[PDB]
């Protein structure tokens, strides 16, 4: 007796406010509410040895890879930069 229904979404319970040029609403009681809020601060540091990944333990492959210029160095530098930025994030968040 359960089924998949499709419908126009409801924006919220309509609530007309009794506005008046001389009417005021003032609370006589309060609630102290605690709300949780989750925020990512960092991510797992990763390092990829470009030569090891592309040409694992093969010198014939490394000879061809070295013809491609500084691509592997650029990738390694980018990943080390990300790794350093992770610790910088953690320091600036938690070490106040």
């Amino acid at each position: 007796s359960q089924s998949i229904i499709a419908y126009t979404m409801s924006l919220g319970a309509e609530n007309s406010v009794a506005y008046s040029n001389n009417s005021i609403a003032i609370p006589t009681n309060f609630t102290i509410s605690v709300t949780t809020e989750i925020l990512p601060v960092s991510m797992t540091k990763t390092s990829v040895d470009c030569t090891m990944y592309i040409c694992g333990d093969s010198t014939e492959c490394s000879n061809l890879l070295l013809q491609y210029g500084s691509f592997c160095t650029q990738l390694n530098r980018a990943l080390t930069g990300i790794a350093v930025e992770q610790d910088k994030n953690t320091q600036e968040v938690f070490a106040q």
Binding site: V34, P40, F94
Partner: protein, 133 residues
């Protein structure tokens, strides 16, 4: 920085409602904030007037708002219904009452007058006693 090491007046930045304080907590690759906030709960209706004209002059609340339950007028703080007698200490005068739209008539109690009247009654009793010898 704003929510934990202090209190933020920014609306809906440190949790919903009027922010009171906050708690940081660690989490796997992240942080969890417990925002402790004040939220008004039970509102009541009142008849309000932007000003009060008592001695020809207009009166405005130093802090809060004017309210009336239909029979008496009080001044109360904005976010909590704590009515108090309209006194010269709680209000300030600004001009007369012909230009303010929506001003209403209500007496403004001045705490100095009862003290002076008690002193005057004491003085009158002392005079009457002095007429006896």
């Amino acid at each position: 920085s704003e929510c934990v090491l202090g209190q933020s007046k920014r609306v809906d930045f440190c949790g919903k409602g009027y922010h009171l304080m906050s708690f940081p907590q660690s989490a796997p690759h992240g942080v969890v904030f417990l925002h402790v906030t004040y939220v008004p709960a039970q509102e009541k209706n009142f008849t309000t007037a932007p000003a009060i004209c008592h001695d020809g002059k207009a009166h405005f609340p130093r802090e809060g708002v004017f309210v009336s339950n239909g029979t008496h007028w009080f001044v109360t703080q904005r976010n909590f219904y704590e009515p108090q007698i309209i006194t010269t200490d709680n209000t300030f005068v600004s001009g007369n009452c012909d230009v303010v739209i929506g001003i209403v008539n209500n007496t403004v109690y001045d705490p100095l007058q009862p003290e002076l009247d008690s002193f005057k009654e004491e003085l009158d009793k002392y005079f009457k006693n002095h007429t006896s010898p």
